[PDB]
Amino acid sequence: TCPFYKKIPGTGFTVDAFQYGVVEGCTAYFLTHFHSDHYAGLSKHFTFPVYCSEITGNLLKNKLHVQEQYIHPLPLDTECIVNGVKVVLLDANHCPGAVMILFYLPNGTVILHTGDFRADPSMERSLLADQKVHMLYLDTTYCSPEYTFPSQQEVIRFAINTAFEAVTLNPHALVVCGTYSIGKEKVFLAIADVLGSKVGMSQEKYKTLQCLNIPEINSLITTDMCSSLVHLLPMMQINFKGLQSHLKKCGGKYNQILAFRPTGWTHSNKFTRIADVIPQTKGNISIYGIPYSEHSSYLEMKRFVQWLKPQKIIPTVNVGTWKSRSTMEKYFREWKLEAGY
Ligand code: NI
């Protein structure tokens, strides 16, 4: 049965609530973004209205085979009416097509549902600034002070320079980037752009990318692995054994691999700045772990919420245990006392 944190009070709306079968009273199902924990349950068998971004809609049609009649794409940054209620979709700065949803309730309450997001100061000059937001449904993935990470830009500059050096030293080296979902596409796009190459990948991954409305995409990606010096593989294959095996598949065209494993946070964010990163190396294979996050750091999340000044916060991540809910509630109370709301 559907949780309270997936329901928008005083409407017949839900958000990211596809795994409970038919939700009693739901007239419109919103989907924030195309990551499997959020879409779980959606298939060609679904027969109620789904509201989402254009990119998400492209993925629902082509990858999950949802029938077109049930997909309702909405533009960004535009006031729209759904079942008699004013809504706005905003860029979530998460993966391609990911949105936040602003609901203007009939009784005058304003609710923001972040979906999954990486808070940014640019959000403070969006449509959110035009009126008071009363209730916040918040992506709390990294709601603890130990969770620091570098900017996306610092991580991309390190990746570009690392790849350019390695391939200029050894023109027969291949660059490999791991992936398991949409998101983090700039890692492999920026490395391929510095090397003057297209990115090569499986037919299934190419199909996905061709749904993302990336300008000039046909000049950037290919299914002809041979022709390319940057390849995509499943994240599970980014290990010494998998990378040796891949090297043997490529028909001796390369004699070395440099690989990137974009992760979330792992224990060693605590000590190490990006410039100090050194790879794990076995023979002619070297692997870099790079902390490229599409979620808010603690500091980024805190800044956003202290600017917004909500009257109530409803967490949407790590809500299955008491301990976790209690710890998050302690930080929300600190933030509120510090900022005076
Ligand atoms: Ni996500």
DSSP secondary structure of 61-108: IIII---GGGEEEE-SS--EEETTEEEEEEE-SSSTT-EEEEEE-TTS
Spatial CB neighbours of 98, under 8 Å, sequence gap ≥ 6 = 32, 33, 53, 56, 91, 92, 115, 116, 117
Output the CA 173–ligand 1 centroid distance in Å: 33
* Residue 169 amino acid letter: L
* Measured distance CA(142)–CA(217) in Å, rounded: 32
Is residue 117 classed as helix, strand or coil in its secondary structure?
coil
Number of neighbouring beta carbons within 10 Å of residue 98: 28
Cα 24 to chain centroid distance, Å, stands at 30
The DSSP secondary-structure symbol of 10 reads T
Q: Which two tokens stand for residue 338?
A: 């510090």
CB 32 within 8 A of CB 15: yes
Geometric angle at alpha carbon 254, from 252 and 255, rounded to 5°: 90
Number of neighbouring beta carbons within 10 Å of residue 89: 25
Q: What is the resolution of this structure in A?
A: 1.3
Output the CA 167–ligand 1 centroid distance in Å: 33
Spatial CB neighbours of 153, under 8 Å, sequence gap ≥ 6 = none
Number of neighbouring beta carbons within 10 Å of residue 20: 15
Question: For tokens 């930080």, what's the residue?
Answer: 331
Q: What is the DSSP string of 160-217?
A: HHHHHHHHHH-TTEEEEEEESSS--HHHHHHHHHHHT-PEE--HHHHHHHTTS--TTG
Output the CA 148–ligand 1 centroid distance in Å: 19
CB 32 within 8 A of CB 98: yes
Annotation: CATH topology of 148-295: Rossmann fold (3.40.50)
Output the CA 268–ligand 1 centroid distance in Å: 23
Output the CA 237–ligand 1 centroid distance in Å: 22
How was this model experimentally determined?
X-ray
The DSSP secondary-structure symbol of 60 reads I
Q: Which sequence spans correspond to the domains of the chain?
A: 1-147+296-341, 148-295
Q: φ and ψ at 29, to 5 degrees?
A: -105, 110
Q: What is the DSSP string of 252-316?
A: TS-SEEEEEEEES--GGGTT--GGG---EEETTEEEEEEE--SS--HHHHHHHHHHH--SEEEE-
Q: Domain 1-147+296-341 in CATH: superfamily?
A: Ribonuclease Z/Hydroxyacylglutathione hydrolase-like (3.60.15.10)
* Measured distance CA(328)–CA(337) in Å, rounded: 15
In Å, the largest CA–CA distance within the chain is 67
CB 253 within 8 A of CB 275: no
Output the CA 282–ligand 1 centroid distance in Å: 33
